[PDB]
Protein backbone atom coordinates (compact mmCIF):
# COMPACT_ATOMS: atom_id res chain seq x y z
CA UNK A 1 0.00 0.00 0.00
CA UNK A 2 1.36 3.33 -1.23
CA UNK A 3 2.69 1.72 -4.45
CA UNK A 4 1.17 -0.12 -7.43
CA UNK A 5 2.14 -3.44 -5.74
CA UNK A 6 1.88 -5.61 -8.85
CA UNK A 7 4.28 -7.99 -10.50
CA UNK A 8 6.42 -6.49 -13.23
CA UNK A 9 5.54 -7.09 -16.85
CA UNK A 10 8.77 -8.71 -17.96
CA UNK A 11 10.06 -7.22 -21.20
CA UNK A 12 12.65 -9.64 -22.50
CA UNK A 13 15.04 -8.10 -24.99
CA UNK A 14 15.87 -9.37 -28.45
CA UNK A 15 19.21 -10.77 -27.21
CA UNK A 16 17.91 -12.42 -24.04
CA UNK A 17 15.22 -14.80 -25.27
CA UNK A 18 17.54 -16.38 -27.81
CA UNK A 19 20.30 -16.68 -25.24
CA UNK A 20 18.14 -18.53 -22.74
CA UNK A 21 16.93 -20.89 -25.43
CA UNK A 22 20.41 -21.67 -26.74
CA UNK A 23 21.54 -22.15 -23.14
CA UNK A 24 18.70 -24.48 -22.29
CA UNK A 25 18.52 -26.43 -25.51
CA UNK A 26 22.07 -27.75 -25.27
CA UNK A 27 21.47 -29.16 -21.81
CA UNK A 28 18.26 -30.99 -22.67
CA UNK A 29 17.28 -33.35 -20.96
CA UNK A 30 18.98 -32.14 -17.77
CA UNK A 31 17.73 -28.98 -16.05
CA UNK A 32 19.53 -25.70 -16.75
CA UNK A 33 19.92 -22.53 -14.66
CA UNK A 34 21.20 -18.96 -14.77
CA UNK A 35 20.55 -15.34 -13.90
CA UNK A 36 18.64 -12.58 -15.65
CA UNK A 37 20.37 -9.22 -15.64
CA UNK A 38 18.20 -6.20 -16.02
CA UNK A 39 17.09 -2.87 -14.66
CA UNK A 40 14.06 -1.88 -12.62
CA UNK A 41 12.09 1.27 -13.55
CA UNK A 42 8.35 1.80 -13.00
CA UNK A 43 6.58 -0.12 -10.25
CA UNK A 44 5.81 -2.86 -12.79
CA UNK A 45 8.28 -2.43 -15.73
CA UNK A 46 11.43 -4.59 -15.63
CA UNK A 47 13.40 -4.68 -18.90
CA UNK A 48 15.67 -7.74 -18.92
CA UNK A 49 18.78 -6.71 -20.85
CA UNK A 50 21.06 -9.76 -20.75
CA UNK A 51 21.61 -13.16 -19.15
CA UNK A 52 24.38 -15.40 -17.97
CA UNK A 53 24.21 -19.03 -16.98
CA UNK A 54 25.34 -20.50 -13.72
CA UNK A 55 27.29 -23.73 -14.38
CA UNK A 56 25.80 -27.17 -14.41
CA UNK A 57 25.38 -29.54 -11.49
CA UNK A 58 25.11 -33.27 -10.92
CA UNK A 59 21.86 -32.80 -9.00
CA UNK A 60 20.34 -30.21 -11.37
CA UNK A 61 18.68 -27.09 -10.04
CA UNK A 62 19.10 -26.60 -6.29
CA UNK A 63 19.57 -23.69 -3.97
CA UNK A 64 22.91 -25.40 -3.49
CA UNK A 65 23.72 -25.17 -7.19
CA UNK A 66 24.09 -21.42 -6.78
CA UNK A 67 27.80 -20.70 -6.43
CA UNK A 68 28.73 -17.24 -5.27
CA UNK A 69 32.12 -17.54 -6.94
CA UNK A 70 30.80 -17.96 -10.45
CA UNK A 71 28.14 -15.35 -9.98
CA UNK A 72 30.29 -12.56 -8.61
CA UNK A 73 33.32 -13.23 -10.78
CA UNK A 74 31.38 -13.30 -14.01
CA UNK A 75 29.80 -10.09 -12.77
CA UNK A 76 33.24 -8.56 -12.34
CA UNK A 77 33.99 -9.36 -15.98
CA UNK A 78 31.08 -7.23 -17.13
CA UNK A 79 32.05 -4.61 -14.61
CA UNK A 80 35.27 -3.81 -16.46
CA UNK A 81 33.37 -3.16 -19.70
CA UNK A 82 30.41 -1.42 -18.05
CA UNK A 83 27.61 -3.70 -19.25
CA UNK A 84 26.61 -5.10 -15.83
CA UNK A 85 23.48 -3.73 -14.16
CA UNK A 86 21.91 -5.64 -11.26
CA UNK A 87 20.34 -9.05 -10.88
CA UNK A 88 16.60 -8.78 -11.53
CA UNK A 89 15.96 -12.50 -11.15
CA UNK A 90 16.88 -15.83 -12.65
CA UNK A 91 15.84 -18.43 -15.18
CA UNK A 92 15.86 -22.21 -15.09
CA UNK A 93 14.43 -24.93 -17.28
CA UNK A 94 11.80 -27.60 -16.79
CA UNK A 95 11.77 -29.51 -20.11
CA UNK A 96 10.17 -32.53 -18.44
CA UNK A 97 7.28 -30.50 -17.07
CA UNK A 98 5.04 -27.67 -18.14
CA UNK A 99 5.43 -24.06 -17.09
CA UNK A 100 5.18 -24.06 -13.30
CA UNK A 101 7.58 -23.96 -10.37
CA UNK A 102 8.62 -27.33 -8.97
CA UNK A 103 8.75 -27.92 -5.23
CA UNK A 104 12.42 -27.03 -5.05
CA UNK A 105 12.39 -23.81 -7.00
CA UNK A 106 9.80 -22.19 -4.74
CA UNK A 107 12.26 -22.28 -1.88
CA UNK A 108 14.94 -21.01 -4.24
CA UNK A 109 12.64 -18.16 -5.23
CA UNK A 110 12.19 -17.47 -1.52
CA UNK A 111 15.88 -16.90 -1.02
CA UNK A 112 16.06 -14.81 -4.19
CA UNK A 113 13.05 -12.79 -3.04
CA UNK A 114 14.82 -12.06 0.24
CA UNK A 115 17.75 -10.48 -1.60
CA UNK A 116 15.60 -8.48 -4.02
CA UNK A 117 11.81 -8.48 -3.82
CA UNK A 118 11.29 -7.97 -7.55
CA UNK A 119 13.05 -11.29 -8.19
CA UNK A 120 11.25 -13.24 -10.90
CA UNK A 121 11.65 -16.85 -11.97
CA UNK A 122 11.15 -17.59 -15.67
CA UNK A 123 10.55 -21.18 -16.76
CA UNK A 124 11.84 -21.98 -20.23
CA UNK A 125 10.72 -24.99 -22.26
CA UNK A 126 13.46 -25.57 -24.88
CA UNK A 127 11.61 -28.75 -25.82
CA UNK A 128 8.30 -27.11 -26.78
CA UNK A 129 10.02 -24.43 -28.86
CA UNK A 130 10.41 -26.95 -31.67
CA UNK A 131 7.03 -25.49 -32.55
CA UNK A 132 6.46 -22.23 -34.33
CA UNK A 133 5.60 -20.92 -30.86
CA UNK A 134 8.04 -20.48 -27.99
CA UNK A 135 6.68 -21.71 -24.65
CA UNK A 136 7.86 -19.36 -21.92
CA UNK A 137 6.24 -18.06 -18.76
CA UNK A 138 7.09 -15.88 -15.77
CA UNK A 139 6.23 -16.35 -12.10
CA UNK A 140 6.92 -14.56 -8.84
CA UNK A 141 6.01 -15.88 -5.45
CA UNK A 142 3.21 -14.51 -3.33
CA UNK A 143 4.13 -15.38 0.25
CA UNK A 144 2.10 -17.74 2.42
CA UNK A 145 1.66 -15.10 5.10
CA UNK A 146 0.57 -12.86 2.23
CA UNK A 147 -2.28 -15.23 1.33
CA UNK A 148 -3.40 -15.20 4.96
CA UNK A 149 -3.54 -11.41 4.81
CA UNK A 150 -5.52 -11.78 1.57
CA UNK A 151 -3.35 -9.33 -0.40
CA UNK A 152 -3.78 -11.20 -3.68
CA UNK A 153 -6.25 -8.75 -5.27
CA UNK A 154 -3.59 -6.12 -4.56
CA UNK A 155 -1.35 -7.73 -7.18
CA UNK A 156 -3.99 -7.70 -9.95
CA UNK A 157 -4.83 -4.02 -9.56
CA UNK A 158 -4.35 -1.81 -12.63
CA UNK A 159 -3.82 -4.65 -15.09
CA UNK A 160 -5.69 -5.57 -18.24
CA UNK A 161 -6.80 -8.66 -16.34
CA UNK A 162 -5.23 -11.03 -18.86
CA UNK A 163 -3.26 -13.90 -17.40
CA UNK A 164 -1.83 -17.18 -18.60
CA UNK A 165 -2.65 -20.76 -17.72
CA UNK A 166 -0.93 -24.10 -18.12
CA UNK A 167 -2.48 -27.52 -17.66
CA UNK A 168 -5.25 -28.20 -15.22
CA UNK A 169 -5.50 -29.59 -11.68
CA UNK A 170 -1.93 -29.67 -10.41
CA UNK A 171 -0.23 -27.18 -12.60
CA UNK A 172 -3.02 -24.65 -12.28
CA UNK A 173 -3.28 -24.95 -8.47
CA UNK A 174 0.29 -23.84 -7.93
CA UNK A 175 -0.09 -21.21 -10.63
CA UNK A 176 -2.82 -18.92 -9.44
CA UNK A 177 -2.95 -19.78 -5.74
CA UNK A 178 0.71 -19.73 -4.62
CA UNK A 179 2.56 -17.47 -7.06
CA UNK A 180 1.47 -14.81 -9.55
CA UNK A 181 1.78 -14.73 -13.33
CA UNK A 182 2.29 -11.77 -15.65
CA UNK A 183 2.54 -11.91 -19.42
CA UNK A 184 5.79 -11.43 -21.32
CA UNK A 185 6.41 -9.01 -24.16
CA UNK A 186 9.36 -8.49 -26.45
CA UNK A 187 11.45 -5.37 -26.73
CA UNK A 188 13.49 -4.20 -29.69
CA UNK A 189 14.81 -1.17 -31.50
CA UNK A 190 14.71 -0.42 -35.22
CA UNK A 191 18.43 -1.18 -35.46
CA UNK A 192 17.84 -4.75 -34.25
CA UNK A 193 14.78 -5.26 -36.42
CA UNK A 194 16.97 -4.55 -39.45
CA UNK A 195 19.65 -6.97 -38.23
CA UNK A 196 17.20 -9.86 -37.96
CA UNK A 197 15.32 -9.09 -41.17
CA UNK A 198 18.46 -9.12 -43.35
CA UNK A 199 19.58 -12.38 -45.00
CA UNK A 200 22.27 -13.26 -47.57
CA UNK A 201 23.82 -10.86 -50.07
CA UNK A 202 22.32 -13.06 -52.79
CA UNK A 203 18.93 -13.36 -51.16
CA UNK A 204 17.83 -10.02 -52.66
CA UNK A 205 19.44 -11.32 -55.83
CA UNK A 206 17.88 -14.80 -55.82
CA UNK A 207 15.19 -14.18 -58.47
CA UNK A 208 17.82 -14.35 -61.20
CA UNK A 209 18.75 -17.78 -59.74
CA UNK A 210 16.76 -19.91 -62.10
CA UNK A 211 16.57 -23.65 -61.41
CA UNK A 212 17.52 -26.65 -63.51
CA UNK A 213 14.91 -27.27 -66.19
CA UNK A 214 14.76 -30.98 -65.41
CA UNK A 215 13.18 -29.97 -62.12
CA UNK A 216 10.74 -27.54 -63.76
CA UNK A 217 9.63 -30.25 -66.18
CA UNK A 218 9.03 -32.50 -63.18
CA UNK A 219 6.75 -29.76 -61.89
CA UNK A 220 4.88 -29.45 -65.19
CA UNK A 221 4.38 -33.21 -65.42
CA UNK A 222 3.22 -33.91 -61.88
CA UNK A 223 0.52 -31.25 -61.77
CA UNK A 224 -1.25 -32.23 -64.99
CA UNK A 225 -1.32 -35.93 -64.13
CA UNK A 226 -2.67 -35.51 -60.61
CA UNK A 227 -5.49 -33.20 -61.69
CA UNK A 228 -6.91 -35.89 -63.99
CA UNK A 229 -7.55 -38.07 -60.94
CA UNK A 230 -9.15 -35.41 -58.78
CA UNK A 231 -11.27 -34.45 -61.80
CA UNK A 232 -12.55 -38.01 -61.97
CA UNK A 233 -13.36 -37.66 -58.29
CA UNK A 234 -15.19 -34.45 -59.15
CA UNK A 235 -17.31 -36.14 -61.81
CA UNK A 236 -18.76 -38.62 -59.34
CA UNK A 237 -19.62 -35.95 -56.82
CA UNK A 238 -21.96 -34.00 -59.13
CA UNK A 239 -23.92 -36.94 -60.51
CA UNK A 240 -26.18 -37.02 -57.46
CA UNK A 241 -26.16 -34.44 -54.63
CA UNK A 242 -29.38 -32.78 -55.68
CA UNK A 243 -31.95 -34.08 -53.19
CA UNK A 244 -32.68 -32.21 -49.95
CA UNK A 245 -30.52 -31.62 -46.85
CA UNK A 246 -27.11 -30.44 -48.02
CA UNK A 247 -25.00 -32.06 -45.28
CA UNK A 248 -26.58 -35.43 -46.02
CA UNK A 249 -25.85 -35.13 -49.73
CA UNK A 250 -22.27 -34.09 -48.93
CA UNK A 251 -21.81 -37.16 -46.75
CA UNK A 252 -23.36 -39.52 -49.31
CA UNK A 253 -21.77 -38.47 -52.61
CA UNK A 254 -18.35 -37.56 -51.50
CA UNK A 255 -18.83 -33.83 -51.10
CA UNK A 256 -16.95 -33.88 -47.87
CA UNK A 257 -13.25 -34.33 -48.60
CA UNK A 258 -14.18 -31.71 -51.19
CA UNK A 259 -12.60 -32.40 -54.59
CA UNK A 260 -14.07 -29.15 -55.92
CA UNK A 261 -11.91 -27.20 -53.50
CA UNK A 262 -8.86 -29.41 -53.95
CA UNK A 263 -8.86 -29.17 -57.73
CA UNK A 264 -8.95 -25.38 -57.78
CA UNK A 265 -6.19 -25.17 -55.16
CA UNK A 266 -3.72 -27.23 -57.14
CA UNK A 267 -4.45 -25.37 -60.39
CA UNK A 268 -3.91 -21.94 -58.84
CA UNK A 269 -0.73 -23.10 -57.11
CA UNK A 270 0.98 -24.38 -60.24
CA UNK A 271 -0.42 -21.46 -62.24
CA UNK A 272 1.36 -18.82 -60.16
CA UNK A 273 4.68 -20.65 -60.28
CA UNK A 274 4.72 -20.93 -64.06
CA UNK A 275 4.17 -17.20 -64.78
CA UNK A 276 7.40 -16.37 -62.91
CA UNK A 277 9.40 -19.18 -64.44
CA UNK A 278 8.51 -17.81 -67.89
CA UNK A 279 9.35 -14.33 -66.65
CA UNK A 280 12.72 -15.49 -65.28
CA UNK A 281 13.83 -17.12 -68.51
CA UNK A 282 12.73 -14.16 -70.63
CA UNK A 283 14.81 -11.82 -68.49
CA UNK A 284 18.00 -13.84 -68.21
CA UNK A 285 18.27 -14.59 -71.93
CA UNK A 286 17.80 -11.00 -73.04
CA UNK A 287 19.53 -9.23 -70.15
CA UNK A 288 22.86 -11.08 -70.05
CA UNK A 289 23.45 -11.40 -73.81
Amino acid sequence: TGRDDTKETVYISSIALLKMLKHGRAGVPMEVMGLMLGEFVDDYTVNVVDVFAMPQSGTGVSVEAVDDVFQAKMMDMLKQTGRDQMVVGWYHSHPGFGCWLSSVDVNTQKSFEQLNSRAVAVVVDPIQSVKGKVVIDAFRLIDTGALINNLEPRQTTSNTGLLNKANIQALIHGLNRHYYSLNIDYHKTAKETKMLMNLHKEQWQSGLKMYDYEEKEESNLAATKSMVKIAEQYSKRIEEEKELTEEELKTRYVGRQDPKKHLSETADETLENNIVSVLTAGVNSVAIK
Binding site: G2, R3, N150, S158
Partner: protein, 270 residues
Protein backbone atom coordinates in the same frame (compact mmCIF):
# COMPACT_ATOMS: atom_id res chain seq x y z
CA UNK B 1 -14.94 34.21 -21.24
CA UNK B 2 -14.34 36.96 -23.79
CA UNK B 3 -17.95 38.10 -24.15
CA UNK B 4 -18.71 38.96 -20.51
CA UNK B 5 -15.83 41.39 -20.11
CA UNK B 6 -16.92 43.38 -23.16
CA UNK B 7 -20.42 43.69 -21.72
CA UNK B 8 -18.85 44.88 -18.49
CA UNK B 9 -16.95 47.64 -20.32
CA UNK B 10 -19.99 48.49 -22.46
CA UNK B 11 -22.27 48.67 -19.43
CA UNK B 12 -25.03 46.14 -18.89
CA UNK B 13 -27.39 44.83 -16.23
CA UNK B 14 -25.80 42.44 -13.70
CA UNK B 15 -28.74 40.07 -14.25
CA UNK B 16 -27.51 39.20 -17.75
CA UNK B 17 -23.93 38.89 -16.57
CA UNK B 18 -25.06 36.49 -13.84
CA UNK B 19 -26.63 34.19 -16.43
CA UNK B 20 -23.58 34.39 -18.69
CA UNK B 21 -21.34 33.32 -15.82
CA UNK B 22 -23.27 30.05 -15.74
CA UNK B 23 -23.99 29.75 -12.03
CA UNK B 24 -27.81 29.93 -12.23
CA UNK B 25 -28.04 26.95 -14.59
CA UNK B 26 -25.97 24.69 -12.34
CA UNK B 27 -28.28 25.35 -9.41
CA UNK B 28 -31.35 24.59 -11.54
CA UNK B 29 -29.98 21.17 -12.52
CA UNK B 30 -29.57 20.30 -8.85
CA UNK B 31 -33.19 21.20 -8.11
CA UNK B 32 -34.36 19.01 -11.01
CA UNK B 33 -32.46 15.97 -9.76
CA UNK B 34 -33.81 16.40 -6.25
CA UNK B 35 -37.43 16.57 -7.39
CA UNK B 36 -37.20 13.58 -9.73
CA UNK B 37 -34.74 11.48 -7.72
CA UNK B 38 -35.93 7.93 -8.41
CA UNK B 39 -33.33 5.29 -7.65
CA UNK B 40 -34.14 1.60 -7.96
CA UNK B 41 -32.56 0.04 -4.89
CA UNK B 42 -32.42 -3.60 -6.00
CA UNK B 43 -29.76 -2.92 -8.59
CA UNK B 44 -27.37 -1.90 -5.80
CA UNK B 45 -28.28 -4.85 -3.58
CA UNK B 46 -27.88 -7.44 -6.31
CA UNK B 47 -24.57 -6.00 -7.45
CA UNK B 48 -23.33 -5.66 -3.87
CA UNK B 49 -23.88 -9.31 -2.98
CA UNK B 50 -22.36 -10.81 -6.12
CA UNK B 51 -19.40 -8.44 -6.80
CA UNK B 52 -17.56 -8.88 -3.51
CA UNK B 53 -15.72 -5.95 -1.96
CA UNK B 54 -12.64 -8.04 -1.24
CA UNK B 55 -11.76 -8.36 -4.93
CA UNK B 56 -10.43 -5.18 -6.46
CA UNK B 57 -12.17 -5.54 -9.82
CA UNK B 58 -15.52 -6.30 -8.21
CA UNK B 59 -15.47 -3.34 -5.85
CA UNK B 60 -14.51 -0.81 -8.51
CA UNK B 61 -17.28 -1.99 -10.84
CA UNK B 62 -19.86 -1.16 -8.22
CA UNK B 63 -18.25 2.13 -7.27
CA UNK B 64 -18.35 3.47 -10.83
CA UNK B 65 -22.02 2.50 -11.22
CA UNK B 66 -22.88 3.87 -7.80
CA UNK B 67 -21.41 7.33 -8.40
CA UNK B 68 -23.23 7.61 -11.73
CA UNK B 69 -26.43 6.52 -9.99
CA UNK B 70 -26.03 9.19 -7.27
CA UNK B 71 -24.58 11.89 -9.53
CA UNK B 72 -25.68 15.41 -8.61
CA UNK B 73 -27.64 14.55 -5.47
CA UNK B 74 -25.91 13.98 -2.13
CA UNK B 75 -26.50 10.27 -1.49
CA UNK B 76 -24.25 8.85 1.23
CA UNK B 77 -26.88 6.34 2.37
CA UNK B 78 -25.32 3.48 0.45
CA UNK B 79 -22.00 4.40 2.07
CA UNK B 80 -23.51 4.22 5.55
CA UNK B 81 -25.42 1.01 4.91
CA UNK B 82 -22.65 -1.04 3.36
CA UNK B 83 -19.74 0.21 5.43
CA UNK B 84 -18.22 -3.29 5.92
CA UNK B 85 -18.36 -3.97 2.20
CA UNK B 86 -16.74 -0.57 1.72
CA UNK B 87 -14.14 -1.49 4.33
CA UNK B 88 -12.97 -4.39 2.17
CA UNK B 89 -11.60 -1.85 -0.33
CA UNK B 90 -7.89 -1.23 -0.59
CA UNK B 91 -5.12 0.02 -2.78
CA UNK B 92 -6.56 1.88 -5.80
CA UNK B 93 -10.08 0.59 -5.24
CA UNK B 94 -10.23 2.77 -2.15
CA UNK B 95 -8.98 5.74 -4.16
CA UNK B 96 -11.87 5.06 -6.56
CA UNK B 97 -14.31 5.05 -3.66
CA UNK B 98 -13.10 8.48 -2.54
CA UNK B 99 -13.32 9.80 -6.09
CA UNK B 100 -16.94 8.55 -6.23
CA UNK B 101 -17.79 11.35 -3.83
CA UNK B 102 -16.98 14.05 -6.41
CA UNK B 103 -19.56 12.56 -8.74
CA UNK B 104 -22.19 12.36 -6.03
CA UNK B 105 -21.69 15.96 -4.91
CA UNK B 106 -21.13 17.24 -8.44
CA UNK B 107 -22.83 20.56 -8.85
CA UNK B 108 -23.85 22.10 -5.54
CA UNK B 109 -20.93 24.47 -5.81
CA UNK B 110 -21.60 26.39 -2.58
CA UNK B 111 -21.26 23.19 -0.51
CA UNK B 112 -18.83 21.58 -2.95
CA UNK B 113 -15.68 22.54 -1.05
CA UNK B 114 -17.41 22.01 2.32
CA UNK B 115 -18.42 18.40 1.68
CA UNK B 116 -14.97 17.11 0.70
CA UNK B 117 -13.32 18.95 3.58
CA UNK B 118 -13.27 15.96 5.99
CA UNK B 119 -11.30 14.00 3.40
CA UNK B 120 -9.02 16.73 2.08
CA UNK B 121 -5.40 16.67 3.32
CA UNK B 122 -4.85 17.85 6.87
CA UNK B 123 -7.94 16.05 8.11
CA UNK B 124 -7.11 12.45 7.16
CA UNK B 125 -4.09 10.28 7.76
CA UNK B 126 -5.54 6.75 7.90
CA UNK B 127 -4.63 5.98 4.28
CA UNK B 128 -3.05 8.00 1.51
CA UNK B 129 -5.70 6.78 -0.92
CA UNK B 130 -8.33 8.92 0.77
CA UNK B 131 -6.06 11.96 0.84
CA UNK B 132 -5.39 11.61 -2.90
CA UNK B 133 -8.84 10.77 -4.23
CA UNK B 134 -10.48 13.66 -2.42
CA UNK B 135 -8.53 16.09 -4.62
CA UNK B 136 -9.57 14.16 -7.74
CA UNK B 137 -13.24 14.39 -6.72
CA UNK B 138 -12.86 18.11 -5.98
CA UNK B 139 -12.02 18.73 -9.63
CA UNK B 140 -15.08 16.77 -10.68
CA UNK B 141 -17.42 18.82 -8.51
CA UNK B 142 -16.10 22.13 -9.88
CA UNK B 143 -15.41 20.92 -13.42
CA UNK B 144 -16.19 23.73 -15.84
CA UNK B 145 -16.40 26.45 -13.16
CA UNK B 146 -13.24 25.58 -11.21
CA UNK B 147 -11.21 28.75 -11.65
CA UNK B 148 -10.94 29.06 -7.87
CA UNK B 149 -10.43 25.33 -7.45
CA UNK B 150 -7.47 25.51 -9.80
CA UNK B 151 -5.68 27.74 -7.29
CA UNK B 152 -6.05 25.20 -4.47
CA UNK B 153 -4.58 22.30 -6.37
CA UNK B 154 -1.79 24.26 -8.04
CA UNK B 155 -0.29 24.88 -4.61
CA UNK B 156 -0.44 21.17 -3.79
CA UNK B 157 1.29 20.37 -7.08
CA UNK B 158 4.18 22.83 -6.87
CA UNK B 159 4.92 21.56 -3.37
CA UNK B 160 4.95 17.90 -4.38
CA UNK B 161 6.61 18.31 -7.79
CA UNK B 162 10.07 18.23 -6.20
CA UNK B 163 9.65 14.80 -4.67
CA UNK B 164 7.57 11.94 -5.94
CA UNK B 165 9.63 8.97 -4.69
CA UNK B 166 7.74 8.58 -1.41
CA UNK B 167 4.56 6.52 -1.22
CA UNK B 168 2.29 9.10 0.36
CA UNK B 169 3.46 11.94 -1.86
CA UNK B 170 2.96 9.83 -4.99
CA UNK B 171 -0.66 8.92 -4.37
CA UNK B 172 -1.40 12.45 -3.17
CA UNK B 173 0.02 14.08 -6.30
CA UNK B 174 -1.87 11.76 -8.66
CA UNK B 175 -5.35 12.96 -7.74
CA UNK B 176 -4.25 16.60 -7.70
CA UNK B 177 -3.05 16.37 -11.30
CA UNK B 178 -6.32 14.88 -12.51
CA UNK B 179 -8.28 17.36 -10.45
CA UNK B 180 -6.62 20.44 -11.92
CA UNK B 181 -7.14 19.13 -15.45
CA UNK B 182 -10.86 19.20 -14.78
CA UNK B 183 -10.72 22.44 -12.80
CA UNK B 184 -8.72 24.32 -15.47
CA UNK B 185 -10.40 22.54 -18.39
CA UNK B 186 -10.73 24.84 -21.38
CA UNK B 187 -8.97 27.73 -19.63
CA UNK B 188 -5.46 27.16 -21.04
CA UNK B 189 -3.66 28.29 -17.91
CA UNK B 190 0.07 28.63 -18.48
CA UNK B 191 0.51 28.50 -14.69
CA UNK B 192 -1.10 25.06 -14.71
CA UNK B 193 1.02 24.01 -17.66
CA UNK B 194 4.14 24.95 -15.71
CA UNK B 195 3.09 23.04 -12.62
CA UNK B 196 2.28 19.82 -14.41
CA UNK B 197 5.31 20.14 -16.65
CA UNK B 198 7.47 19.68 -13.56
CA UNK B 199 5.58 16.56 -12.51
CA UNK B 200 6.26 15.17 -15.97
CA UNK B 201 9.95 15.99 -15.69
CA UNK B 202 10.00 14.48 -12.20
CA UNK B 203 9.56 11.07 -13.82
CA UNK B 204 7.01 10.13 -11.19
CA UNK B 205 5.98 6.46 -11.06
CA UNK B 206 2.22 7.06 -11.31
CA UNK B 207 1.68 10.85 -11.44
CA UNK B 208 3.33 11.31 -14.82
CA UNK B 209 0.25 9.67 -16.33
CA UNK B 210 -2.10 12.15 -14.69
CA UNK B 211 0.19 15.10 -15.48
CA UNK B 212 0.12 14.39 -19.21
CA UNK B 213 -3.64 13.98 -19.36
CA UNK B 214 -4.31 16.99 -17.16
CA UNK B 215 -2.18 19.26 -19.33
CA UNK B 216 -4.20 18.31 -22.42
CA UNK B 217 -7.39 18.99 -20.50
CA UNK B 218 -6.27 22.45 -19.43
CA UNK B 219 -4.69 23.34 -22.79
CA UNK B 220 -7.56 21.93 -24.85
CA UNK B 221 -7.31 22.71 -28.55
CA UNK B 222 -4.73 25.48 -28.32
CA UNK B 223 -2.09 23.62 -30.30
CA UNK B 224 0.79 25.73 -29.04
CA UNK B 225 3.98 24.69 -30.86
CA UNK B 226 6.18 24.76 -27.75
CA UNK B 227 3.82 22.40 -25.92
CA UNK B 228 3.56 19.98 -28.81
CA UNK B 229 7.30 19.85 -29.44
CA UNK B 230 8.04 19.48 -25.73
CA UNK B 231 5.60 16.63 -25.29
CA UNK B 232 6.48 14.84 -28.51
CA UNK B 233 10.11 14.54 -27.47
CA UNK B 234 9.48 13.65 -23.85
CA UNK B 235 7.75 10.36 -24.61
CA UNK B 236 11.03 9.28 -26.14
CA UNK B 237 12.96 10.61 -23.17
CA UNK B 238 11.03 8.78 -20.49
CA UNK B 239 11.04 5.00 -20.26
CA UNK B 240 8.16 4.53 -17.81
CA UNK B 241 5.25 2.72 -19.43
CA UNK B 242 2.43 4.76 -17.95
CA UNK B 243 3.90 8.12 -18.99
CA UNK B 244 4.49 7.12 -22.60
CA UNK B 245 0.82 6.16 -22.91
CA UNK B 246 -0.29 9.36 -21.24
CA UNK B 247 1.65 11.68 -23.55
CA UNK B 248 0.42 9.86 -26.63
CA UNK B 249 -3.15 10.54 -25.58
CA UNK B 250 -2.45 14.05 -24.38
CA UNK B 251 -1.05 15.16 -27.72
CA UNK B 252 -4.51 14.45 -29.13
CA UNK B 253 -6.17 16.58 -26.47
CA UNK B 254 -4.06 19.69 -26.99
CA UNK B 255 -4.56 19.40 -30.76
CA UNK B 256 -8.31 19.02 -30.53
CA UNK B 257 -9.96 20.86 -33.41
CA UNK B 258 -6.74 21.56 -35.35
CA UNK B 259 -7.83 19.84 -38.52
CA UNK B 260 -5.10 20.55 -41.10
CA UNK B 261 -2.89 22.38 -38.61
CA UNK B 262 -2.29 19.14 -36.69
CA UNK B 263 -1.82 17.14 -39.89
CA UNK B 264 1.97 17.04 -39.54
CA UNK B 265 1.90 15.70 -35.98
CA UNK B 266 -0.49 12.99 -37.09
CA UNK B 267 1.95 11.88 -39.76
CA UNK B 268 4.82 11.59 -37.30
CA UNK B 269 2.91 9.58 -34.75
CA UNK B 270 1.58 7.05 -37.21
Amino acid sequence: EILVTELTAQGYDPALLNILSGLPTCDYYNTFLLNNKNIDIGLLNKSKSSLDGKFSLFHTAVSVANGFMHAGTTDNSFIKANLPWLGKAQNWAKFTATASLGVIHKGNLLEGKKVMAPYLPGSRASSRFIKGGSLYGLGLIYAGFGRDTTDYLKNIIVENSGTSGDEDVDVLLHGASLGIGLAAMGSANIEVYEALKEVLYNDSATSGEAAALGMGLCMLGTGKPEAIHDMFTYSQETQHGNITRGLAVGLALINYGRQELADDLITKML
